[PDB]
Amino acid sequence: PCDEPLVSGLPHVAFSSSSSISGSYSPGYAKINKRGGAGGWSPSDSDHYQWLQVDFGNRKQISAIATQGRYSSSDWVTQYRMLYSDTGRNWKPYHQDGNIWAFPGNINSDGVVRHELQHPIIARYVRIVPLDWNGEGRIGLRIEVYGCAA
């Protein structure tokens, strides 16, 4: 199977984001079941144009993704898009059931929600783009991406 956790072991330098509320919300804190910093990533502004990015360093085959909100807070993502690229540019949106896919997100701060992809993708870089978030807070996010070397 192609389902090893690809994010949990990455150093901070593998993560980037559109913005962060502060250093404690840096994108390297966006790891499921971990509570460092603010307990997850949050951008300084919550809209439809933020992103959390991971660079796996080379191409990985990806079979599933999992998300959580920001630890013990009102910040969580309720639906999201996934984009991927081999180059870091020309992002490709993940498609499922005939359209760009909106993944159901979280409904609380700490439940993990894992989705098996209909079809695996191959990518060096992944971006998670929040589409909506909890109305009583902001975007807050921790992730895992499951896969293997391409």
mmCIF file of C-alpha atoms in Angstrom:
data_model
loop_
_atom_site.group_PDB
_atom_site.id
_atom_site.type_symbol
_atom_site.label_atom_id
_atom_site.label_comp_id
_atom_site.label_asym_id
_atom_site.label_seq_id
_atom_site.Cartn_x
_atom_site.Cartn_y
_atom_site.Cartn_z
ATOM 1 C CA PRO A 1 0.000 0.000 0.000
ATOM 2 C CA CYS A 2 0.924 3.646 -0.571
ATOM 3 C CA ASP A 3 -0.186 5.231 2.692
ATOM 4 C CA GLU A 4 2.729 6.380 4.857
ATOM 5 C CA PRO A 5 2.316 9.732 6.651
ATOM 6 C CA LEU A 6 4.282 12.196 4.529
ATOM 7 C CA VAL A 7 3.885 15.362 6.645
ATOM 8 C CA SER A 8 4.387 14.324 10.275
ATOM 9 C CA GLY A 9 8.175 14.100 9.985
ATOM 10 C CA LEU A 10 8.877 17.215 7.899
ATOM 11 C CA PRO A 11 10.962 20.123 9.219
ATOM 12 C CA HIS A 12 9.545 23.635 9.438
ATOM 13 C CA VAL A 13 11.410 24.621 6.258
ATOM 14 C CA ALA A 14 9.207 22.279 4.186
ATOM 15 C CA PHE A 15 6.100 24.329 5.046
ATOM 16 C CA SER A 16 4.968 27.683 3.716
ATOM 17 C CA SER A 17 1.736 29.648 3.680
ATOM 18 C CA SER A 18 0.022 32.730 2.323
ATOM 19 C CA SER A 19 0.326 34.327 5.793
ATOM 20 C CA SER A 20 0.231 33.517 9.495
ATOM 21 C CA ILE A 21 -1.295 35.299 12.477
ATOM 22 C CA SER A 22 2.072 35.182 14.280
ATOM 23 C CA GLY A 23 5.121 32.979 14.652
ATOM 24 C CA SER A 24 3.124 30.603 16.871
ATOM 25 C CA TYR A 25 0.774 30.016 13.921
ATOM 26 C CA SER A 26 3.610 29.206 11.508
ATOM 27 C CA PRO A 27 2.645 26.591 8.914
ATOM 28 C CA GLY A 28 5.025 23.967 10.310
ATOM 29 C CA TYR A 29 2.618 23.691 13.252
ATOM 30 C CA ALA A 30 -0.036 22.264 10.871
ATOM 31 C CA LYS A 31 0.589 18.615 11.828
ATOM 32 C CA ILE A 32 -2.289 16.429 13.007
ATOM 33 C CA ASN A 33 -2.330 15.306 16.650
ATOM 34 C CA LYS A 34 0.454 17.752 17.527
ATOM 35 C CA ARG A 35 -0.043 20.864 19.614
ATOM 36 C CA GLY A 36 3.095 22.966 19.244
ATOM 37 C CA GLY A 37 2.836 26.710 18.885
ATOM 38 C CA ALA A 38 -0.743 27.926 18.583
ATOM 39 C CA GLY A 39 -1.813 24.341 17.890
ATOM 40 C CA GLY A 40 -2.132 24.726 14.132
ATOM 41 C CA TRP A 41 -1.771 27.134 11.253
ATOM 42 C CA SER A 42 -4.019 30.159 10.830
ATOM 43 C CA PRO A 43 -3.576 32.864 8.178
ATOM 44 C CA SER A 44 -3.764 36.476 9.266
ATOM 45 C CA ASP A 45 -6.895 36.913 7.115
ATOM 46 C CA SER A 46 -9.558 34.258 6.497
ATOM 47 C CA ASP A 47 -10.929 34.307 2.947
ATOM 48 C CA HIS A 48 -11.058 32.017 -0.089
ATOM 49 C CA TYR A 49 -7.504 32.884 -1.173
ATOM 50 C CA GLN A 50 -5.301 31.529 1.609
ATOM 51 C CA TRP A 51 -3.143 28.440 1.389
ATOM 52 C CA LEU A 52 -0.962 26.073 3.369
ATOM 53 C CA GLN A 53 1.829 24.461 1.344
ATOM 54 C CA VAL A 54 4.058 21.431 1.896
ATOM 55 C CA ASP A 55 7.105 20.578 -0.222
ATOM 56 C CA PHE A 56 7.854 16.853 -0.076
ATOM 57 C CA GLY A 57 11.155 17.474 -1.894
ATOM 58 C CA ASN A 58 10.458 15.007 -4.702
ATOM 59 C CA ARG A 59 7.416 13.390 -6.257
ATOM 60 C CA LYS A 60 5.141 11.384 -3.970
ATOM 61 C CA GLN A 61 2.128 9.302 -4.841
ATOM 62 C CA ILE A 62 -0.695 10.426 -2.570
ATOM 63 C CA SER A 63 -3.679 8.291 -1.603
ATOM 64 C CA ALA A 64 -5.390 10.172 1.235
ATOM 65 C CA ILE A 65 -5.497 13.423 3.172
ATOM 66 C CA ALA A 66 -6.541 14.204 6.724
ATOM 67 C CA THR A 67 -7.309 17.468 8.486
ATOM 68 C CA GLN A 68 -7.949 18.819 11.954
ATOM 69 C CA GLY A 69 -8.723 22.268 13.258
ATOM 70 C CA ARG A 70 -6.454 24.276 15.512
ATOM 71 C CA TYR A 71 -6.057 22.659 18.944
ATOM 72 C CA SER A 72 -8.693 23.599 21.523
ATOM 73 C CA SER A 73 -10.008 26.666 19.717
ATOM 74 C CA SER A 74 -12.870 27.880 17.561
ATOM 75 C CA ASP A 75 -10.640 27.791 14.464
ATOM 76 C CA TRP A 76 -11.262 25.037 11.929
ATOM 77 C CA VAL A 77 -11.715 24.606 8.198
ATOM 78 C CA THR A 78 -15.131 23.260 7.175
ATOM 79 C CA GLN A 79 -14.394 22.593 3.483
ATOM 80 C CA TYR A 80 -11.275 22.856 1.386
ATOM 81 C CA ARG A 81 -9.677 22.366 -2.009
ATOM 82 C CA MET A 82 -6.386 20.585 -2.648
ATOM 83 C CA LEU A 83 -3.948 21.804 -5.297
ATOM 84 C CA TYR A 84 -0.769 20.090 -6.365
ATOM 85 C CA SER A 85 2.284 20.675 -8.517
ATOM 86 C CA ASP A 86 5.630 19.182 -9.413
ATOM 87 C CA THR A 87 7.286 22.587 -9.896
ATOM 88 C CA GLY A 88 5.730 24.863 -7.275
ATOM 89 C CA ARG A 89 3.854 26.792 -9.980
ATOM 90 C CA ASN A 90 0.921 26.099 -12.323
ATOM 91 C CA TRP A 91 -1.123 24.538 -9.540
ATOM 92 C CA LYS A 92 -3.498 21.741 -10.516
ATOM 93 C CA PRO A 93 -6.753 21.427 -8.550
ATOM 94 C CA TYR A 94 -7.682 17.953 -7.404
ATOM 95 C CA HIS A 95 -10.761 16.699 -9.287
ATOM 96 C CA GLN A 96 -13.241 14.047 -8.128
ATOM 97 C CA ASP A 97 -16.643 12.949 -9.459
ATOM 98 C CA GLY A 98 -16.212 15.137 -12.543
ATOM 99 C CA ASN A 99 -15.347 18.539 -11.043
ATOM 100 C CA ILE A 100 -12.822 20.357 -8.898
ATOM 101 C CA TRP A 101 -13.426 18.696 -5.558
ATOM 102 C CA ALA A 102 -14.531 20.382 -2.335
ATOM 103 C CA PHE A 103 -13.419 18.127 0.514
ATOM 104 C CA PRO A 104 -15.669 18.090 3.584
ATOM 105 C CA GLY A 105 -13.601 19.510 6.416
ATOM 106 C CA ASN A 106 -13.834 19.533 10.177
ATOM 107 C CA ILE A 107 -16.753 20.173 12.527
ATOM 108 C CA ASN A 108 -14.674 20.816 15.667
ATOM 109 C CA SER A 109 -11.146 21.733 16.740
ATOM 110 C CA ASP A 110 -9.653 18.283 17.332
ATOM 111 C CA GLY A 111 -11.494 15.521 15.463
ATOM 112 C CA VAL A 112 -9.409 14.095 12.615
ATOM 113 C CA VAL A 113 -11.195 13.768 9.258
ATOM 114 C CA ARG A 114 -9.475 11.531 6.689
ATOM 115 C CA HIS A 115 -10.539 11.181 3.044
ATOM 116 C CA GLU A 116 -9.314 8.487 0.685
ATOM 117 C CA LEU A 117 -8.814 10.024 -2.743
ATOM 118 C CA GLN A 118 -10.942 8.516 -5.502
ATOM 119 C CA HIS A 119 -7.761 8.382 -7.575
ATOM 120 C CA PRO A 120 -4.219 8.894 -6.271
ATOM 121 C CA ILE A 121 -2.204 11.848 -7.516
ATOM 122 C CA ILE A 122 1.532 12.343 -7.876
ATOM 123 C CA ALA A 123 3.051 15.598 -6.685
ATOM 124 C CA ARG A 124 6.089 17.195 -5.113
ATOM 125 C CA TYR A 125 4.089 20.079 -3.595
ATOM 126 C CA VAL A 126 0.586 20.171 -2.118
ATOM 127 C CA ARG A 127 -1.499 23.201 -1.171
ATOM 128 C CA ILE A 128 -4.606 23.091 0.986
ATOM 129 C CA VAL A 129 -6.924 25.996 0.157
ATOM 130 C CA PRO A 130 -9.689 26.587 2.744
ATOM 131 C CA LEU A 131 -13.075 27.288 1.200
ATOM 132 C CA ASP A 132 -14.970 27.895 4.449
ATOM 133 C CA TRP A 133 -14.268 27.896 8.170
ATOM 134 C CA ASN A 134 -16.043 27.926 11.505
ATOM 135 C CA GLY A 135 -18.120 31.085 11.829
ATOM 136 C CA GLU A 136 -17.159 31.587 15.481
ATOM 137 C CA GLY A 137 -13.453 31.661 14.593
ATOM 138 C CA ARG A 138 -11.042 31.675 11.700
ATOM 139 C CA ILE A 139 -9.233 29.208 9.480
ATOM 140 C CA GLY A 140 -7.239 26.834 11.666
ATOM 141 C CA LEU A 141 -5.571 23.754 10.274
ATOM 142 C CA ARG A 142 -3.409 20.706 10.903
ATOM 143 C CA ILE A 143 -2.905 18.123 8.150
ATOM 144 C CA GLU A 144 -1.536 14.760 7.174
ATOM 145 C CA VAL A 145 -0.983 13.481 3.643
ATOM 146 C CA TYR A 146 -0.671 9.723 3.124
ATOM 147 C CA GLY A 147 1.375 8.197 0.328
ATOM 148 C CA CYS A 148 4.751 6.959 -0.792
ATOM 149 C CA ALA A 149 7.640 7.684 -3.118
ATOM 150 C CA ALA A 150 6.374 7.947 -6.689
#
